């Protein structure tokens, strides 16, 4: 019974600037500008988007870091994780 | 208070991660470094575990699953890592002992359910009880 892998997701809200989301994708998910831009767009269009798939351990830490950054920059950018 | 041997291991795992610009020093980094920790190695050998394979598995897992930092924020311990270490410190204190050993840390790893490290230990048929029996009571070898 190997540990399960987890999707790290960003959810859409009306108060976070698109610029900040791009900042997040670049700083925490190592995306270049172009890939980061289309992922933020998908988040705004579809309401949420999978930004990566990591091991449970990494995913857990990653989600806590991203939310901490958002909160420190006074934005409501909510990051979550889902199994499978 | 972490005997000097453990410090070396903890420093070793930490360097292992930085050396590869890993975004995180994980529980798996911890276990691999513990393989060279006498206190920890002894408990595992006493449990009849193929240390050659385990090292191969952990090293392969770390390379493929640990995110690398962009050439453009230092290495960070996973929350799982922090819990393991804090669990070992607490138990040693709460059981009335002065030093934390690699074996104590090894024990604490079994509590991280979703860690690859706990999984690999179970795969080599080593349970928490097996390590605990060896540490506390005689060189209670698996067999
Ligand atoms: N959650 C509370 C921790 C309690 N720890 C008790 C450790 C006691 C070890 N000696 C036990 C006596 C064995 N007969």
Swiss-Prot record, chain A:
<comment type="function">
    <text>Involved in the modulation of the specificity of the ClpAP-mediated ATP-dependent protein degradation.</text>
</comment>
<dbReference type="GO" id="GO:0030163">
    <property type="term" value="P:protein catabolic process"/>
</dbReference>
<comment type="similarity">
    <text>Belongs to the ClpS family.</text>
</comment>
<dbReference type="GO" id="GO:0051087">
    <property type="term" value="F:protein-folding chaperone binding"/>
</dbReference>
<protein>
    <recommendedName>
        <fullName>ATP-dependent Clp protease adapter protein ClpS</fullName>
    </recommendedName>
</protein>
<dbReference type="GO" id="GO:0140678">
    <property type="term" value="F:molecular function inhibitor activity"/>
</dbReference>
<dbReference type="GO" id="GO:0009408">
    <property type="term" value="P:response to heat"/>
</dbReference>
<dbReference type="GO" id="GO:0006508">
    <property type="term" value="P:proteolysis"/>
</dbReference>
<comment type="subunit">
    <text>Binds to the N-terminal domain of the chaperone ClpA.</text>
</comment>
From Swiss-Prot, chain B:
<feature type="domain" description="Clp R">
    <location>
        <begin position="1"/>
        <end position="142"/>
    </location>
</feature>
<feature type="region of interest" description="Repeat 2">
    <location>
        <begin position="77"/>
        <end position="142"/>
    </location>
</feature>
<protein>
    <recommendedName>
        <fullName>ATP-dependent Clp protease ATP-binding subunit ClpA</fullName>
    </recommendedName>
</protein>
<comment type="subunit">
    <text>Component of the ClpAP complex composed of six ClpA subunits assembled into a hexameric ring in the presence of ATP, and fourteen ClpP subunits arranged in two heptameric rings. Binds to ClpS.</text>
</comment>
<comment type="function">
    <text>ATP-dependent specificity component of the ClpAP protease. It directs the protease to specific substrates. It has unfoldase activity. The primary function of the ClpA-ClpP complex appears to be the degradation of unfolded or abnormal proteins.</text>
</comment>
<comment type="similarity">
    <text>Belongs to the ClpA/ClpB family.</text>
</comment>
<feature type="region of interest" description="Repeat 1">
    <location>
        <begin position="2"/>
        <end position="65"/>
    </location>
</feature>
